[PDB]
Enzyme design. Structure first.
Site, PDB file in Angstrom:
ATOM      1  N   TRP A 195       0.810  -1.330  -0.087  1.00  0.00           N
ATOM      2  CA  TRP A 195       0.022  -0.067   0.043  1.00  0.00           C
ATOM      3  C   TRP A 195       0.942   1.277  -0.008  1.00  0.00           C
ATOM      4  CZ3 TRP A 195       0.206  -3.372   4.212  1.00  0.00           C
ATOM      5  CH2 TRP A 195       0.467  -3.058   5.378  1.00  0.00           C
ATOM      6  N   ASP A 248       5.826  -4.840   3.094  1.00  0.00           N
ATOM      7  CA  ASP A 248       6.133  -5.620   4.129  1.00  0.00           C
ATOM      8  C   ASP A 248       7.387  -6.416   4.059  1.00  0.00           C
ATOM      9  OD1 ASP A 248       3.762  -4.724   5.489  1.00  0.00           O
ATOM     10  OD2 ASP A 248       2.562  -6.325   4.691  1.00  0.00           O
TER      11      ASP A 248
HETATM   12  N1  LIG Z   1       1.136  -3.654   6.786  1.00  0.00           N
HETATM   13  C1  LIG Z   1       0.116  -4.816   6.733  1.00  0.00           C
HETATM   14  O1  LIG Z   1       0.772  -5.985   5.868  1.00  0.00           O
HETATM   15  C2  LIG Z   1       0.029  -5.470   7.919  1.00  0.00           C
HETATM   16  C3  LIG Z   1      -0.955  -6.659   7.964  1.00  0.00           C
HETATM   17  C4  LIG Z   1      -2.297  -6.238   8.258  1.00  0.00           C
HETATM   18  C5  LIG Z   1      -3.613  -7.508   8.215  1.00  0.00           C
HETATM   19  C6  LIG Z   1      -3.020  -8.857   8.235  1.00  0.00           C
HETATM   20  O2  LIG Z   1      -3.987  -9.779   8.230  1.00  0.00           O
HETATM   21  C7  LIG Z   1      -4.578  -9.998   9.307  1.00  0.00           C
HETATM   22  C8  LIG Z   1      -1.640  -9.038   8.085  1.00  0.00           C
HETATM   23  C9  LIG Z   1      -0.688  -7.911   8.024  1.00  0.00           C
END
Ligand SMILES: *NC(=O)Cc1ccc(OC)cc1
Ligand SMILES: *NCCc1ccc(OC)cc1
Lengths: 122, 360, 110, 360
Positions: A51, A70
């Site tokens: 994002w 990530d």
């Molecule tokens: N920045 C995101 O990748 C963090 C995140 C949010 C929700 C997830 O699954 C429940 C995983 C990682």
């Protein structure tokens, strides 16, 4: 330009959810997880997708495009959890959305930590 | 004495609620916790591996989960699945294979739903390209991949049709999909633009009636979609806010943040003051109770820092959830009455659901 | 009182009391499987003043219950007295060894 | 900027410690947390699935883990494994298959060890029948069960021999196993009874010297096993306690509860007052420092509720661990000196270990 260079800044400052470039982070800051703002902790893999959005830099007064990649393939780091939402939007604006796992297309999708990569001026 | 297994849940289905615990700190060990809302008793649980999602079958007989496995968790081949579990024995019955793109994300209701008739599970994919996947429950098969929904997000079932649902698209309108009895797309339609994506984005969570749905926006407006006909008719905005409310910058915030009591038309919304950019997921300072016919607020009560809710129509109940604790409210009258709080129902939950009692 | 770690029958429980987990002292929560093997404790009954053998069978095949964690060690001994020892998972021989909760089954007088 | 992986641990090996977090509340997501003991910095982690165990290769190049997987976690086929991970990259390299009976239990050092020469990993099995498993590191293979160790528990390597170790048996004696170059048993021997199992049970954790080991008992006695010669010679008890100590019922308590500083002969032990049946795993009220030559206490300091410890002979350090926090002590003098506490190193850890420096 220390405000643009986390590695030159105070660690306590970059490891804070209030650090200016972390303005749409949902996850654990990688800089608290054995990595840095722009490097994955050892043995975790960058996401090729992310994002994105803009954050205001109060030090130089300019707005910057941040990419929220990530690091993946290790279980949850657990440290420096943030849930900041500046300019974040729901999944019908998918690449502005932070309630999804941006490790979703990695070879291993297990979420380890997230960070804030400076792309450029907004 | 002899230790025995094989037992069923000790309370009747009508007492049961399902708290989806993401366990984000240890997200590979997410699970569903089953509670009795009448007394707070823990009844059992269903393990759901990495970032599980959950729903109960509309007929009340089965629990469906959606999750991702890998051969060695953090390495090896991925398997995205739906699992069917017995609701009373809380045992695994079957695995349904999905393509390796099921949505991994926080537990909004609209990511894992079912048709009104209960015959198809309807789930959100992201690869990151989006599509809606259809699972035939009886066949135990993934049968359709709705690529027409690319650029859209989430599933809002139409309670007045057996196999129809809507999704919110990047044009600010709604796409309606009507499935055939084989689970393949039988027809579709697109509404006119309902909201401005840029200027007044809506929260995805519907306040869902039998023949219409309402949505609230980041700035406290309400949009509606009427699906009494085959073509969905859209309208709005009307404001949740009066002038006093506006002076203190009240806006909505949360996740599963709205609900509708269908008999009365009351809509429940989590709200907080001092709204500004970035506060759309803030915990509730208040719950506001809106009359959707008069388009005016009728009551406001303390929000108990809640983030998500759900409504039971037939017992006139609302649950709210702050991430860890579940509050039980009687909403038989316009002012909700707090009956109890179930403390420590989860470590990191943004979704609670009642066991269905209404049948199909 | 059965959900308290100080309940007399729980004198060598290391784990989560199944009675807090949708089960009871002698029944596994739904969808969890009894262990055929267990550690044993000798616990003092505060009513009749007699000592009783308690068999600490686990319930298995579901992830950690997380409720009513206890770590009581009356008459517990190390792994060289293996069936008196409670720092091992007594689900170890089940079809699925994931540990869910611990029961406290009264066997009889010590 | 560009996000990159492939990086090594930022601090040198000699700064590193390994905190084995069982994460008991979510035991399927146990992990090793890597810290810099000099400044408390988190350096990285290794995921270890259900109830992981960990050690570092004697040569300091690799991290060995031991864990259990199932195809669907809570159902499906079981795989017990040793994994070899690169120490500096914290990446997975190799899986070594074990029979499906590796010990599942709390992280005592002696459940997962290696021969002095580093060529064999030596681990405890329980099906619940006990045996010792031998893994050939060069071959990446399981050799075979040491069935002679039935009725015994845990592995105490002999630091004066390349591929010999001992285990504590239900007869109150020690069994010594000497492996051949292929990892099979070449010879064995059994000591006389060292301790009364019924009247003075010992803790399994050794205070390990190069050619002898000391053990403490539930009632505060010390037993010794001397393996300098052809066969093991056993003796004891001697008491840790003076009359004043006895009057206040001081006894040992903890898990990895002792350590030996080999150069000085100082033995470190966690102790608490008001001992009685059931207090053998109580947190430390104090750490006592014993001269094992004079059999006298030379220091006593606050225990900080510690449960487990480890000693570094090369830097003259002791770490202690209370389940979540790691205390770093300088033990170059008889009175330990507290240097710092690393807060929140784990949620549920009973084992910490240094990265090896030297030790040939
Ligand atoms: N920045 C995101 O990748 C963090 C995140 C949010 C929700 C997830 O699954 C429940 C995983 C990682
Ligand atoms: N009844 C014993 C519960 C238990 C103890 C230890 C363990 O391994 C970490 C699992 C289960």
């Amino acid at each position: 330009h220390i405000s643009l260079n986390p590695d030159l800044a105070n660690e306590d400052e970059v490891n804070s959810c209030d650090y200016w470039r972390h303005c749409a982070v949902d996850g654990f800051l990688c800089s608290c997880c054995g990595g840095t703002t722009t490097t994955c902790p050892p043995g975790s893999t960058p996401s090729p997708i992310s994002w994105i959005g803009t954050c205001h830099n109060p030090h130089d007064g300019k707005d910057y495009l941040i990419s929220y990649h990530d690091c993946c393939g290790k279980t949850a780091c657990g440290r420096c959890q943030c849930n900041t939402q500046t300019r974040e939007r729901p999944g019908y604006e998918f690449f502005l959305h932070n309630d999804v796992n941006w490790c979703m297309a990695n070879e291993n999708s297990t979420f380890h930590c997230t960070t804030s990569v400076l792309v450029g001026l907004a | 004495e002899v230790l025995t297994g094989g037992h069923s849940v000790s309370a009747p289905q009508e007492n049961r609620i399902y708290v989806m615990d993401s366990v984000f700190m240890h997200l590979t060990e997410s699970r569903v916790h089953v509670y009795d809302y009448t007394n707070g008793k823990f009844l059992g649980m269903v393990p759901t591996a990495f970032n599980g999602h959950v729903q109960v079958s509309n007929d009340g007989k089965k629990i469906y989960t959606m999750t991702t496995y890998h051969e060695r968790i953090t390495r090896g081949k991925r398997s995205d699945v739906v699992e069917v579990w017995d609701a009373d024995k809380l045992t695994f019955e079957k695995e349904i294979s999905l393509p390796p793109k099921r949505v991994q994300g926080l537990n909004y209701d609209g990511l894992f739903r079912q048709t009104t008739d209960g015959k198809f599970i309807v789930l959100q994919n992201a690869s990151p390209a989006t599509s809606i996947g259809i699972v035939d429950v009886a066949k135990g098969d993934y049968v359709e991949d709705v690529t027409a929904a690319a650029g859209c997000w989430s599933v809002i079932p139409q309670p007045n049709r057996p196999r129809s649902f809507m999704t919110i698209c990047g044009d600010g309108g709604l796409l309606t999909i009507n499935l055939g009895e084989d689970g393949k797309v039988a027809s579709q339609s697109r509404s006119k633009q309902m909201f401005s994506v840029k200027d007044d984005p809506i929260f995805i969570a519907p306040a869902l009636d039998k023949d219409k749905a309402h949505f609230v926006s980041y700035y406290g407006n309400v949009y509606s979609a009427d699906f009494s006909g085959d073509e969905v008719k859209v309208d709005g905005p009307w404001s949740l806010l009066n002038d006093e409310d506006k002076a203190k910058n009240w806006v909505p915030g949360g996740y599963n943040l709205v609900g509708l009591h269908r008999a009365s038309g009351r809509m429940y919304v989590f709200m907080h003051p001092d709204g500004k950019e970035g506060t759309h997921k803030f915990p509730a300072a208040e719950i506001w109770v809106m009359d959707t016919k008069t388009k005016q607020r009728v009551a406001r009560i303390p929000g108990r820092d809640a983030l998500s809710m759900t409504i039971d129509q037939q017992r006139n109940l609302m649950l709210t959830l702050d991430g860890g604790n579940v509050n039980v409210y009687d909403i038989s009258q316009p002012e909700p009455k707090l009956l109890r709080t179930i403390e420590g129902a989860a470590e990191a939950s943004l979704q609670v659901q009642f066991h269905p009692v209404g049948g199909t």
